[PDB]
Amino acid sequence: IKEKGKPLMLNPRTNKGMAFTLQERQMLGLQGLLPPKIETQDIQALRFHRNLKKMTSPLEKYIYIMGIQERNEKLFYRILQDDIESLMPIVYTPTVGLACSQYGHIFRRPKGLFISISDRGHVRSIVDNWPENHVKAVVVTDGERILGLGDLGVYGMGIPVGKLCLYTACAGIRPDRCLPVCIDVGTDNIALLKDPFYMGLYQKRDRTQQYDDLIDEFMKAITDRYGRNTLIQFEDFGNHNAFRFLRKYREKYCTFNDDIQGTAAVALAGLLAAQKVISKPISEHKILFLGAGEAALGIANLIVMSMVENGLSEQEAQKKIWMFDKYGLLVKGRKAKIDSYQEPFTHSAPESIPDTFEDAVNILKPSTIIGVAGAGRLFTPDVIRAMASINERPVIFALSNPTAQAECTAEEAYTLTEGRCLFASGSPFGPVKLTDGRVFTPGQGNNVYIFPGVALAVILCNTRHISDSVFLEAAKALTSQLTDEELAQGRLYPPLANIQEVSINIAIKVTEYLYANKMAFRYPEPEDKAKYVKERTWRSEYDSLLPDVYEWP
Amino acid sequence: IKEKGKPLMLNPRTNKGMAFTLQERQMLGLQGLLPPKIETQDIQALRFHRNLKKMTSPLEKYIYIMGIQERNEKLFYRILQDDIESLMPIVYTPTVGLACSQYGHIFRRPKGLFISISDRGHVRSIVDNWPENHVKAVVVTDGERILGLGDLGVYGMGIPVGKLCLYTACAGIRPDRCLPVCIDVGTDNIALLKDPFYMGLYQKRDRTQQYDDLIDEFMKAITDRYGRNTLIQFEDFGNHNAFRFLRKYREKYCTFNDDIQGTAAVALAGLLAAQKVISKPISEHKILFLGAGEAALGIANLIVMSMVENGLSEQEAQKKIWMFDKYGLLVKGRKAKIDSYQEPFTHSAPESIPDTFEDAVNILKPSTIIGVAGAGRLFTPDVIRAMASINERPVIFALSNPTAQAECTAEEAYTLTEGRCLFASGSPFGPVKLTDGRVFTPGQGNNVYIFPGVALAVILCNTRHISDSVFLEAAKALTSQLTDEELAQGRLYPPLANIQEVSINIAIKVTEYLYANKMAFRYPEPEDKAKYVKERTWRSEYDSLLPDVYEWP
Amino acid sequence: IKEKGKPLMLNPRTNKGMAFTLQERQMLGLQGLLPPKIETQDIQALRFHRNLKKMTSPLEKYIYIMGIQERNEKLFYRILQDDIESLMPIVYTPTVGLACSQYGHIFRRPKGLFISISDRGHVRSIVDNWPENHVKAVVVTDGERILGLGDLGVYGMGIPVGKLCLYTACAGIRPDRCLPVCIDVGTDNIALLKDPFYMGLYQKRDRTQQYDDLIDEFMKAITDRYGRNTLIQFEDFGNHNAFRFLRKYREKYCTFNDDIQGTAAVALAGLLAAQKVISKPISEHKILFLGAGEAALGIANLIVMSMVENGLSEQEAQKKIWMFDKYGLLVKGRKAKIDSYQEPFTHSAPESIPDTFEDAVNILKPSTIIGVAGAGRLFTPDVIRAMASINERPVIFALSNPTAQAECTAEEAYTLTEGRCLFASGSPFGPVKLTDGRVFTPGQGNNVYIFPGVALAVILCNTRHISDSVFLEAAKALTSQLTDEELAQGRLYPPLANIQEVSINIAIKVTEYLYANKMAFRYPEPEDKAKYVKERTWRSEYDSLLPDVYEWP
Ligand SMILES: NC(=O)c1ccc[n+]([C@@H]2O[C@H](COP(=O)([O-])OP(=O)(O)OC[C@H]3O[C@@H](n4cnc5c(N)ncnc54)[C@H](O)[C@@H]3O)[C@@H](O)[C@H]2O)c1
Ligand SMILES: NC(=O)c1ccc[n+]([C@@H]2O[C@H](COP(=O)([O-])OP(=O)(O)OC[C@H]3O[C@@H](n4cnc5c(N)ncnc54)[C@H](O)[C@@H]3O)[C@@H](O)[C@H]2O)c1
Ligand SMILES: NC(=O)c1ccc[n+]([C@@H]2O[C@H](COP(=O)([O-])OP(=O)(O)OC[C@H]3O[C@@H](n4cnc5c(N)ncnc54)[C@H](O)[C@@H]3O)[C@@H](O)[C@H]2O)c1
Ligand SMILES: NC(=O)c1ccc[n+]([C@@H]2O[C@H](COP(=O)([O-])OP(=O)(O)OC[C@H]3O[C@@H](n4cnc5c(N)ncnc54)[C@H](O)[C@@H]3O)[C@@H](O)[C@H]2O)c1
Ligand SMILES: NC(=O)c1ccc[n+]([C@@H]2O[C@H](COP(=O)([O-])OP(=O)(O)OC[C@H]3O[C@@H](n4cnc5c(N)ncnc54)[C@H](O)[C@@H]3O)[C@@H](O)[C@H]2O)c1
Ligand SMILES: NC(=O)c1ccc[n+]([C@@H]2O[C@H](COP(=O)([O-])OP(=O)(O)OC[C@H]3O[C@@H](n4cnc5c(N)ncnc54)[C@H](O)[C@@H]3O)[C@@H](O)[C@H]2O)c1
Ligand SMILES: O=C([O-])C(=O)[O-]
Ligand SMILES: O=C([O-])C(=O)[O-]
Ligand SMILES: O=C([O-])C(=O)[O-]
Ligand SMILES: [Mn+2]
Ligand SMILES: [Mn+2]
Ligand SMILES: [Mn+2]
C-alpha cells in the first residue's frame, strides 16, 4: 500500500481500527488518530457478536453487518467466517430479498459499478472509474428477475453485492479482485416508478437493440481493461435475455449464468445423493418440474447429461422429464407458446390433460418433483400426499426463493409423507421432529454450494471458457463429500456450516478437471493441485502494513 | 478540492451521495460509482426521518445519527437543523452520557485527536497528524469529571465530540475548523481498568508533574501549529485541575472553561429572568448552593458581578451567597477544608449548623436554590415543600446532569409547590400540567445556550484572551431575547427550537462588546456587526464541486 | 490518469507543458500554473532543435536530451523521432559510453531500479517500490562489461537506461511498461572505488553463491509482481555469468542475452547481405574472429545454423570458423583455456602457429574477418592490406564499441583496400570518398537493429521462452529489407533513418513465426499480423486528458 495517514482509515480495504499496531501507527502517520488502545481482531469480533446478539430484526442485522464491509473489510469477513451458517439467512436468502425490495429506504453508501442505458457510447469511461486495477471476477445483473421477487430494477444491485461476498466467504477469492455490476435500462415496476427513493432511471425497460448493444459494449469494456479471461457471472436476468447472452458469449468470453448452470449442478448433486438411498432403476425415473424457465431447463439439461452417461440415449432421457408452467403441462400442440429450449421436454399429451399440478402428479405419476416457479406454496398437502401415495420414497425439491415463494416447507414435506420423502429447499429451514419422535434435518439446494468453488477453479487455471461438463463435474464433486451419517439425518448435501472446505474441495476437483481436459492455461501446471489451491486463498487475518526496514552490512 | 475519484466519496467532508450532480460526477471521475438517480438533500433528509421514526431506543438513534457524521457531513447537520430540539436529548444530555459509558461497546470509528501520557515529548508529531490545517476551535477533556458520571477515562471523548457538533449546529462554526481532543493519563475507574473494550491506557491516573508537563506540551503544540489565538475550551476536567489550568492559561492563551464560566453565564441569565417576575429587593436575595465545585463557584462569581454592578459591594454581595457541599455547610472553622475560591462564600456559622440540606434551607431560609452536586435527587419533596413554604415564589434550579443525577424533576418541582416555583434544569424535561389544569414549560439552564455564540464571536474578532465580563455580557445577551409570552409559559430561557438565532444574536452582541472594549483584533472593524457575523456562518446546503470552466475571448 | 493539479506537471509521464489545452487546464486544476500561451508539440519541437543547434559537445547534448525524459516524456520521444539518425550517436554509442564513465559527475536524477547485494533477502520489497504496475520488459546489467570499457559498476546504469529508450523510439513499446535495472554487488574498478562521486557500494565484486542468490531472488521478485512472461533482457554482464545465466534461465523465464543473441542476428544479417554481392561458394567460406567472447560465440553459432540450414552439417560448418583471442589462435591442446562453448571452434593447430593476428590472417587466409575484442585498432593497415591481397572482396566487420575501441575505421577499411572491402562497424562512421572520387556509405552492425523488434514481437505474442531460431528469423527479416540500391552504395543494412519501420517490420515477421511454431499465446490469434502490430504501437502524440463529459437523455 502506497498511502499513509488518515486515507488508510477511510478506505475499508486497509482500515484495521484499533488493530493497527503501535509501530504501524507511528510509521504510517496514525498516532493520535486512534485511541491509545491496541486491540486484536478477536476483541473486535467479540464486540460484534455482543452487539448482534442484542439486535431484534433480520433487516436491522443485515444493515449492521453489510455496513462493516464499508468500514473494515478484514473484520467483515472474519465475522462471517465465525459462523457462516447463522449469518447466511441474513446476508443471503431470504433477508437479502427483503433488503433488495427495500434498497432505496436503507441506502447509505453505494456498492459496485452502475451502467445505465443513458451512458451508451461511454461505458468504457465508466469502467475506467473503478478504483481496483486487477478485477478477476464480475457478477452482473439487470434486475429483471430478482429471486422470485421479479423486476426490482436497480434495487436489485443487492444481489451481485451479496453474491461476491460469498465468493470471498466461501472460496477465499480476493475481495479487491471482485466487481459487482448493475445494468440499468429502466424497470417495468409501476410501484418503483412512483417511488421517490428509487435508485435507477425513471423509465420502462428498453428492450430494443439498444439494450443488446449496451450489454455488448459492457462485455467489451470490462475485458479491454481487465483481460479476456475475466470471469463474468450473469445473475438474475430475465428468462429471454439470460439464455440469449449465455449462448452469445459463452464461446467468446469466460462467462456463465448462475441461475441456469449453477442451479443445474446443485440440483443434480441432490438428485445423486437421493439415488444413493433409493437406488431406483433408471428406466423408472420420471421427473416433473413446476415451472419451465432458467432453473428448470438448466437442471433438466444436466440431468439428461447424467442419465445419458449412465446409459440412456439423449432422446430417451428427455422423455423422462416433464414440465408444468403457468399455462399448464408442456405438451405438443398446446396453445401456449413453447420455446426452443423447452421443445425437447415438450411431449405428446398423455391420456388426459392435467388442469392443476395435482392432476399432473396423478396422471404422470412422477418419482421426483422439482419446484422452481417462484410462485409460492404450489406443492399443496394434496400434492405432497399424492407423491407419498404414488411413491414409497418421493423426492420433493422446493427450490424457489425467497422463503415466502417456496413451494412448501420442510415440515410440510416430512409430516405429510410420514418422514418418507427426500426433501431439499432453496431457502433455509430448520430440523423437523414428527409427533413420533423422529427428527429430519434437510439440506439447502442452493447454487451457493456451487458458484464459489467453480469460480475459484476457473480463475486459478486462467480458463477461457466454461463448458457444461464443468458443472457436471462440480455436481459430482459436491455430492462426493456427503457422508453416510449426514445422509442418514436426511441431508442431501454436506452441512452448510462447512461450506468453506466443501468449496475449496470442489475448486480442487474442478481445476484437476480443467487441466486434464486442456482447459487450463496457467503455467507451469501444478503437480499438487490441492496444495496449489489451498495455497492461494485469501485470508481474513490482518496483514502487517509496516515498511521493510533493515540494516545494511 | 484537490481530490477526485472515490476519495471524494470516502471522505465525509465531501461525500454528497446521490446528490452529486451528473456534471460533478462526469467531471470528477465518479460516473458509474453511484446509482443513476440524482437526489436532492431534501430527499436524503426524508429517508433519515423515515428511518429514525422506526427506531425504538435512544442509544440506537445516537449510533445512527452520529454515524452520518462519518458518512456525509453536510446531511448530518441538515438532519440536526431540521429539528434541533427533538434530537438534542439523543445527541446531547442525557443520552450522550449513556453513550460515553457505552463507548467501548458501540465503537466503529474514532473521532478526535488522542494524546496520552505515554506520548509525552511527541505531542507535536501527533498534532501534525491531524488532516485539517486551519483549526480555530478546540474542546479538550481528560475524562475525570464526565457530566455527573465521574471518571470515565478515554470513554469521555464522546463529550468534546458532542460539544463541537453544537459549535456548528448552533453557531454555524465550520466543522473542518473544529478539533475534539482527549488527554489520556490513565483512569482510576476500577471497572474500566478491567474492561477488555476500554479505549485508553490501562493505568491509574498519573497526577505527578508529568501530568502538568503534558498539558503544557499540548497547549504549546496546538498553538505552534494553528496560531496563538486558537480557541481552546476546557471541558469536564476534575475540580482542582480545572481551576488551576484556567488561572494558568487564560492570559497566555485564548482559553476558557465551559463548566466554570459557561455555566455561570447560563445560570445568571435564568436568574435574571426570574427576577423579572419576582422583582425582589436586592438586599433580600439569599442564595444557597447544593455543591461548591466548578459550576457552583463560577455561577457565584458572576452573580456577585451582576450584584456589584447593580449597587452592592463585592463583600456585601458574597454575603448573600451560601454553599453546602458533601461535607455540609461551608462555615468558618469547619473541619472539612475550604479552598481559596471558597473563602469569599464561607461565612461565620449561623445559630445552628444544618446537618442535612433540608436543615440548611430551613435555617438559612434561601430565596433561591441551585443544585450542582451531581449526586442525584438531593432536592427532596421535603426540601421543595420547605421552599414553597418559605418563599411565595421559590427559585429552584436542578442543574446536575445527566437526568439521573438531577436534584429533582419538573413534575416534582411544580407539583409540590402548586405551580409557584420558577424552575430550570440542566437536562430536558417536558411540560407539567397540574390537576387544576395549569401547564408549565420549564427552560433548560445548560451551557449549550452559551458556548456556541461566545466561541463564534471570539473566533471572528481574532480575540486573544477571554475575560469574565465577556460571560457577564453573554448572560445579558441571552436573557434579553426572552419574551414575556414565553416567561408567561414558565420559561426562564428562549425556546430551544430557536437556539440557532439565539446563538447568532448572542454572538453579534459579544463581538460588539469585544470591539468596544478593544479585545477584537480582526481588521478592519465591521461597521455593521450583525451583517458581519451573519455573513460568515457555515451552511448545511451542499456546495458545488465543479471546476471553474469558462471560455476565453 | 486519476491525479489532478501540480502532480500532473511534476510527473514527466503526464506533463505537457504549454501543450495542455485550456479546457484541460480548467477541468484538471492547472489554470494559472502555466503561462497564458497554449502551444503545440510542433512549437516545443522547434524550441528543442533551436537550442541543440547552439550546443557544442555531445555530452552536453546528451545531458540536455536525457533530461527531457525527466520533464516531458511525450516530447522526449517526439524529439528522437524527428531525427533518430542524428541523435543516435549521442543517446547511444559512442556518447553513451562517455556518459557512463562520467555518470557520477553528471548526476541530477536517478533512473531505474537499483538492487544491491546489501538488499539480499529484501529484493521483493524493492521491486514493490517501482511506481508502475504493468511492466512488460526489463533490461538489466551488473556493469561488469560495459561496452568495451569494462567494469564500471553502478555507472553502467546508463546502458540499460539507453536500451529501453530505443525500445520505445524504435519499436513503439510503451515507456511505462519498461524497467531498467542495475545489480550492484560491488566493482573491481580500483579507480571507482576511489571516486567520491561513485554511485555504488564501495567494495570489490562479490563472486560467491550470494551473487547467484541475488540474481535468483531478482528473477523471482520480478516475475511474481508482473508475471511469468515478462521480458527480461540481459545486457553487459561479464563473460562467465552471461552464458551461465542465459542457460540457467532461458527455459524457466522469458529471457535472452542481447550481447550473445542480439549481436548474433545483426552480424548474420550483414553477412547475408554481403553474400548477395560476393556469391562466394558456401564451400569456401572462411571466417576468422578476433575475440572469443559473448558476441564471437554468439555470431559463430548463428552463422553455423545458417550454413547447416543451407546444406552443410554442423560439423563441417564449424570447421570453417576460427577464433583468435588475447592468447592466440584457438587450437586444440593450446596452453590457455578453451571453454565448453569455444570447443566446436577450437580446431587442430595449423602447420604453423600464428604469433600475431596478421600472421593468423596470412596462415588461415580467411574470406571474412570479425572484430569483437573491444581492445582497440587491432585490424591494422597491414592486416587490412593482407585481407585485400588474399581477397578480391574481403569482408571486414569491426564491431567493438565504443568507437575508440573499434578495430579500424571505415576510412581505413575502404581506402586501404581501394574500395573492394565490404565493411560494417558497431559504432557510427560517416561516408568515405576515395582520392579517385568513389564514395562509400558504411552500415552499422549493432544489435539495435534487432532487440527492439524482437521484444515487441515476444511481448505482443505473450511468448514464454525465446529460442535461438527466433534470432535466425530476425536476421532474415532485417536483411530482407535491404534494397539493391543501398547495397550498391556499400550499406549491408537498411538506413538508420528507417530503424522505426525496419523494426516494426521485423516484429511483424517474428510474430508470424512465433504463432506459426505455436510459440504465441495471446488469444485469439490475429488474422492480419501486420495490422495487429501496427495497431498496438505507442505514439509520441499527446493524448487528451479530458474527463468524459456528456449529456443524458
Ligand atoms: N497488487 C497487485 O496488483 C498484485 C499482487 C500480487 C499478484 N498480482 C498478479 O498475480 C499474478 C502472479 O500470479 P500469482 O502468484 O498471484 O498466482 P498464480 O499465477 O498461481 O494464479 C493464477 C491467476 O489467479 C489469480 N489469483 C490467485 N489467487 C487469487 C485469489 N485468491 N483471488 C482472486 N484471484 C487470484 C492471479 O491473479 C492469477 O492471474 C501476476 O500476473 C500479477 O499481476 C498483482
Ligand atoms: N435454489 C436455487 O439455487 C435457485 C437458483 C435460481 C433460481 N431459483 C428460484 O427459482 C424461481 C424461478 O427462477 P427462473 O430463473 O427459473 O425463472 P423464470 O422467470 O426463468 O421462469 C419462471 C417459470 O415459473 C413458471 N410459473 C410462474 N408461475 C407459475 C405458477 N403459478 N404455476 C406454475 N408455473 C409458474 C413460469 O411459467 C416459468 O416457466 C425463482 O423464485 C428463483 O428464486 C432458485
Ligand atoms: N447544566 C449545565 O450547564 C452544567 C454545566 C457544568 C456542570 N453541570 C453539572 O454540575 C454537577 C457538578 O459538576 P462540577 O463541575 O461542579 O463538579 P465538582 O466536582 O467541581 O463539584 C461538585 C461539588 O458537589 C459536591 N457534592 C457531591 N456530593 C454531594 C452531596 N451528596 N451533597 C452535597 N454536595 C455534594 C462536592 O463536594 C463538590 O463540591 C455535574 O453533575 C455536572 O453534570 C451542569
Ligand atoms: N482553505 C483554507 O485553508 C482557507 C480558506 C479560506 C480562508 N482561510 C483563512 O481565513 C483568513 C481570511 O479571512 P476570512 O475571509 O476567512 O474571514 P474574516 O477575516 O472575516 O474572519 C476572521 C477570522 O475568523 C475565522 N472564521 C471566519 N468564519 C469562520 C467560521 N464560520 N468558522 C470558523 N472560523 C471562521 C477566519 O479563519 C479568520 O481567521 C486568512 O487568514 C486565511 O488563512 C483559509
Ligand atoms: N492502465 C492499465 O494498467 C492498462 C490499460 C490497458 C490495457 N491493460 C492490460 O492489457 C491487457 C488487454 O490487452 P490489450 O487490449 O492491451 O492488447 P493485446 O491483448 O492485444 O496485447 C497483448 C499483450 O501485449 C501488451 N502490449 C500491447 N501494446 C503494448 C505496447 N505498446 N507496449 C508494451 N506492451 C504492450 C499487452 O499488455 C498485452 O498483455 C489486459 O491484460 C490489461 O490488464 C492495462
Ligand atoms: N556491435 C554490437 O552490436 C556489439 C554487441 C555486443 C558486444 N560488442 C562489442 O564486442 C566487444 C567484446 O564484447 P564481448 O561480449 O564479446 O566480450 P567478452 O569479454 O565476452 O569477450 C572478449 C574477447 O576478446 C578477446 N580479447 C581481449 N583482448 C584481446 C586482444 N588484445 N587481442 C585479441 N583478442 C582479445 C578475449 O580473449 C575474449 O575472447 C566489446 O567492445 C563490445 O562493445 C558489440
Ligand atoms: O435466483 C436465485 O433465487 C438464487 O440464485 O438463489
Ligand atoms: O458538564 C455538564 O454537565 C455540561 O457541560 O453540560
Ligand atoms: O555491448 C555493446 O557494445 C552493445 O550492445 O552495443
Ligand atoms: Mn439468482
Ligand atoms: Mn461539561
Ligand atoms: Mn551490450
Side-chain angles (χ1 to χ4, degrees), chain A residues 115-171:
Chain A
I115 294 158
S116 79
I117 188 59
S118 281
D119 301 297
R120 45 172 13 229
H122 304 267
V123 178
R124 181 54 189 288
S125 76
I126 265 152
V127 159
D128 279 334
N129 270 353
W130 193 244
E132 303 308 331
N133 307 326
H134 206 143
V135 175
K136 298 252 65 186
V138 171
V139 172
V140 65
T141 193
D142 76 343
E144 185 158 37
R145 207 242 61 198
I146 292 299
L147 294 185
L149 268 27
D151 187 347
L152 287 184
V154 180
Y155 271 6
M157 168 63 113
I159 302 301
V161 168
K163 226 84 204 201
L164 280 166
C165 282
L166 300 169
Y167 258 54
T168 296
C170 297

Side-chain angles (χ1 to χ4, degrees), chain B residues 286 322 329 331 348-354 359-360 362-365:
Chain B
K286 170 112 64 136
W322 290 90
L329 193 77
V331 295
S348 309
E351 330 77 86
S352 48
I353 278 43
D359 295 338
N362 286 301
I363 289 174
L364 267 21
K365 296 207 166 344

Side-chain angles (χ1 to χ4, degrees), chain C residues 145 148 239 263 291-295 325-326 372-374 399 401 445-447:
Chain C
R145 203 240 64 200
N239 193 299
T263 323
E294 319 186 27
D325 54 51
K326 80 293 235 10
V372 55
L399 322 186
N401 298 319
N446 194 290
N447 54 54

